[PDB]
Design a protein around this ligand. Sequence first.
Ligand SMILES: NC(=O)c1ccc[n+]([C@@H]2O[C@H](COP(=O)([O-])OP(=O)(O)OC[C@H]3O[C@@H](n4cnc5c(N)ncnc54)[C@H](O)[C@@H]3O)[C@@H](O)[C@H]2O)c1
Ligand SMILES: NC(=O)c1ccc[n+]([C@@H]2O[C@H](COP(=O)([O-])OP(=O)(O)OC[C@H]3O[C@@H](n4cnc5c(N)ncnc54)[C@H](O)[C@@H]3O)[C@@H](O)[C@H]2O)c1
Ligand SMILES: NC(=O)c1ccc[n+]([C@@H]2O[C@H](COP(=O)([O-])OP(=O)(O)OC[C@H]3O[C@@H](n4cnc5c(N)ncnc54)[C@H](O)[C@@H]3O)[C@@H](O)[C@H]2O)c1
Ligand SMILES: NC(=O)c1ccc[n+]([C@@H]2O[C@H](COP(=O)([O-])OP(=O)(O)OC[C@H]3O[C@@H](n4cnc5c(N)ncnc54)[C@H](O)[C@@H]3O)[C@@H](O)[C@H]2O)c1
Lengths: 251, 267, 268, 267
Amino acid sequence: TGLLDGKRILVSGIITDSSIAFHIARVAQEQGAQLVLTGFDRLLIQRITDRLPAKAPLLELDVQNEEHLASLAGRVTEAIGAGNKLDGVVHSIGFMPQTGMGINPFFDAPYADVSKGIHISAYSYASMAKALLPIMNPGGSIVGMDFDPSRAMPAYNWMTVAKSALESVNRFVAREAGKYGVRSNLVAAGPIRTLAMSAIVEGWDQRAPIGWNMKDATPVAKTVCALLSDWLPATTGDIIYADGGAHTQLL
Amino acid sequence: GLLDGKRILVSGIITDSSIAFHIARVAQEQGAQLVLTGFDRLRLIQRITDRLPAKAPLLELDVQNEEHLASLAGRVTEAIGAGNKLDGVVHSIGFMPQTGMGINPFFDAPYADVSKGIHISAYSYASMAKALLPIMNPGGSIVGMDFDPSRAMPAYNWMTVAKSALESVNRFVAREAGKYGVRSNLVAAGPIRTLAMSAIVGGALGEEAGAQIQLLEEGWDQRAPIGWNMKDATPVAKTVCALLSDWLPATTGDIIYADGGAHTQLL
Amino acid sequence: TGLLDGKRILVSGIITDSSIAFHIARVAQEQGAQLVLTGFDRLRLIQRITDRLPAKAPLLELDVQNEEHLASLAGRVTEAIGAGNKLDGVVHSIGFMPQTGMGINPFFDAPYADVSKGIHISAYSYASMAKALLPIMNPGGSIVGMDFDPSRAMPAYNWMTVAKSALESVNRFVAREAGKYGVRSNLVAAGPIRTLAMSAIVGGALGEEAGAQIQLLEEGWDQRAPIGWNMKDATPVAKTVCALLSDWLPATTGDIIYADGGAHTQLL
Amino acid sequence: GLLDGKRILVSGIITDSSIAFHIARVAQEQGAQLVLTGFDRLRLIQRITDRLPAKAPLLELDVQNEEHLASLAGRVTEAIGAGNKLDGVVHSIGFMPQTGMGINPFFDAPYADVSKGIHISAYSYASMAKALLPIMNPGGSIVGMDFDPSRAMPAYNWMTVAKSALESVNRFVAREAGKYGVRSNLVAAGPIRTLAMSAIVGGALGEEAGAQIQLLEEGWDQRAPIGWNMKDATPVAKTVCALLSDWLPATTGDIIYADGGAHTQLL
Ligand SMILES: NC(=O)c1ccc[n+]([C@@H]2O[C@H](COP(=O)([O-])OP(=O)(O)OC[C@H]3O[C@@H](n4cnc5c(N)ncnc54)[C@H](O)[C@@H]3O)[C@@H](O)[C@H]2O)c1
Ligand SMILES: NC(=O)c1ccc[n+]([C@@H]2O[C@H](COP(=O)([O-])OP(=O)(O)OC[C@H]3O[C@@H](n4cnc5c(N)ncnc54)[C@H](O)[C@@H]3O)[C@@H](O)[C@H]2O)c1
Ligand SMILES: NC(=O)c1ccc[n+]([C@@H]2O[C@H](COP(=O)([O-])OP(=O)(O)OC[C@H]3O[C@@H](n4cnc5c(N)ncnc54)[C@H](O)[C@@H]3O)[C@@H](O)[C@H]2O)c1
Ligand SMILES: NC(=O)c1ccc[n+]([C@@H]2O[C@H](COP(=O)([O-])OP(=O)(O)OC[C@H]3O[C@@H](n4cnc5c(N)ncnc54)[C@H](O)[C@@H]3O)[C@@H](O)[C@H]2O)c1
């Protein structure tokens, strides 16, 4: 054999059967990887986590909770076993209060709202790396989820700003990760119908030279496993676009 | 006079090395009439603003203060007279606490420090536009100061993250500003010796400041096909006046690089 | 006080009064520039066209594929502006791509000899013109070429997109050379403007699917642009070029300035 | 076996330091069945490909030769057997004449020289795709080799122009390829000690060859967060295989950087 055989990976961000994190975890387990999972609030997740092909420890983690971050390493070590380390970490987390999304006016988002958004969606990437790098093996891999923010657009609003920030953060985490011989990258996915796309939240399939199925997250999850594997060992601080090639075509 | 008869708000003056100070000087030399906004040290800023070619009303603006922002348009209108609107708004403002800069470990900057830096350095760009667009004339221009953050670097640390946010915020302000027939652009400048450079960047670099900066300067001058002088703010001031003018009317949500062309060169 | 007062500037690419180069020339003259014009193939028609300009400028023949034209250009420009005088500005406003590499013609069916001719006229000629004219340019000078944002693929523009990609690369290298003379080099990436090349080169290769082909791009570009876009008005592009020809962007080189209403910074 | 049972054309082998050689090697290690193409000195090339892990047919291919291109697909099919198709195609080829490289002045390259360089190095990507697409399986992958040309630099000169053309060509190739259910992508690789590096690049650098190559070897390593080893083609080769695999099913017309992460860092 499996692409991720014998690799110990932490996956965050599972909230539904539809969550990009869930399909990441599923594909990872298929490829031999042994996992540890984190959730937020509805610990509802161990049931959805129960749908996975193999059992994995479900640790609670709130990226706004400095205590959670401080203990996360030790609570992971206790799950995978002492003297064992992580080869992979997946950041699949975002949030933006309704005020900075959709049809709400861009100028009407209070900074407290935005700050919370950027906190959970961008800064948390730096902090998860801080907590986990001390227990990661050389050759290891950190991966975050992203939506191409290099052009403005309707609806995405302040999440676009947060992702922009995340991209910048990613390049700095890479500076730090390199000291451990660990890589850091983002997978910039196209739209997938998840709890976040409908809850908070044609043209893409047209631009994509190979098309795009907004119903299927497997192609995104495969791309994530790719980065977590040993087959992209010269790529860091970077972004891989799993968007059907859409971002490379004007029309 | 490149800016004859334009009424323009210039924020960000703190010393006479401030990029905003040179934007102000040049704009006045080119016939503009200014409203200036300082933060915190108003008595000292007044003395500094008194040394510009012409007099200009100075108003107080803390971009973290929600009440300063609510009264800004009214205060400006009072300063430029009833009936008169702005044609230009220069945003030349930044901050990031020491923890988020220099040789202080990237992972050690607490989010309260980062958030504040991003509030002042990025979100406030949307804040200013929100407060001043109601009082802008069609054909107007909003300009902010950038430092190319598309690649990571030493020392700039979290301010790099805030600049990336700023570019994104700029593109959305463009959309909003478009409803007023107003443009919104950033000028990404190369390194310039300002108070920020001395107090925030150098002070965070500590014992590594001399080497780190000399290699910043040498490498920037070498990469720039037409060279680069950290002591001279005028070429950047000139570029901002270009965007304020009517000579770049089809450009918005964009970034103009006033950096000697260093970002177009690998070495 | 004209933006370009007392500047001597070479402008290529005028073929009609719809040419981007025509509006550039017109606006440059209105701002006090003394112009020298260069034209291709149909000199007589161009001569009558430049007669519509504010002032009568000298017109010199330049086929960018002709070595003899390039080798003798500086000498002829010098004769035009008077000896001892130098140019402050050079405008490259020149493009060509044969029919096989445009429109609905299959991308794979364009022969290399056709592509290479397009790359020669549209991209390499930027370096050729710089080579010839740099020795007759003053410091603080400015070389500007017209671009069309090729960073993503699109229908119809096909191989001209490749040529533009090559041009952006050439520009960054021309900057290095130009820097030795105190001269800046930049591209203006303009949005779609109704020119001869628009109708004949691009319109002709689109067959019947052109009218709306072009009419649907005039609306699409305008929708994306936060400040709008008028594809029948070249003035905002010509003003932008004159801005780079002036002293007001003295720290910008090897670079690309987008006069496209901001469309390229917006997704939908 | 990441490429178990895959049929892949690998062009560009000339010596056992060629990026193509290592691409082929690793592809064979992962169970791929290969067809190789070489140019000019084919008896010499066959002796190099003899050093690969397994036996692969060698086909002559000058990408400037119309007859070679017109027969390619048939010759491939003859090699892999009637009714079988390619799942992969590697374009690992480039050339630029001396006048267009090194310390020879940029302005002195005749167009005929640049054009030859662009034909072999950029146009040939489209012509290879044109010949091989009709015999590619869905789920297939075409990969070409890139060196990040987004900024200008010493020495690389017109090859940089050629690489910029390539990336543009790649984005159009993806459009055509997509009709066949095939991806097309470039791998931008950091510097690797190969024949072209020494004979063409080093060749045109004259007395400055050593210094530029020493700087490249160490400066690229410092910039790359994970380090860079200019003497190991393996990570680049692994990256190419990753694109030939089914593990990047949603990426096309794109560029993947196998460069140590250097292009994301300014210093
Ligand atoms: N759905 C898409 O189309 C799409 C496209 C591009 C990028 N992305 C990105 O992919 C990632 C995953 O989201 P998704 O698309 O799978 O839908 P989702 O609803 O499953 O994503 C939300 C996740 O964030 C977690 N989370 C929220 N606040 C948290 C906190 N304070 N601490 C810890 N975890 C917290 C949630 O519990 C949840 O599992 C995000 O970063 C998202 O923006 C999604
Ligand atoms: N110095 C350079 O090399 C350089 C290069 C590129 C971009 N910039 C940018 O240009 C702008 C101005 O910086 P500078 O170089 O002129 O140094 P500076 O110190 O002269 O100006 C920085 C400004 O931010 C203002 N400020 C800080 N907090 C504020 C608040 N809460 N409310 C209102 N104003 C506040 C300061 O008072 C000051 O006037 C910044 O955005 C900076 O990042 C500087
Ligand atoms: N019209 C648009 O939408 C648009 C948008 C962005 C950029 N551009 C660019 O602006 C420039 C001018 O194009 P235009 O839109 O003004 O149409 P145009 O037809 O008026 O200008 C084209 C010019 O190219 C010149 N030319 C062709 N072959 C030549 C040769 N061998 N030697 C010397 N000159 C030669 C022609 O003589 C002509 O004057 C080009 O570089 C073009 O790609 C056009
Ligand atoms: N060596 C590096 O540092 C580096 C870095 C990034 C990308 N690249 C790229 O990788 C690819 C291979 O280059 P390399 O570094 O392995 O050097 P190399 O000398 O080992 O390979 C160059 C190949 O081009 C082939 N070629 C030249 N003309 C041809 C023609 N007319 N028809 C068919 N093949 C022809 C040669 O025969 C040779 O095998 C190129 O696209 C190159 O630019 C090299």
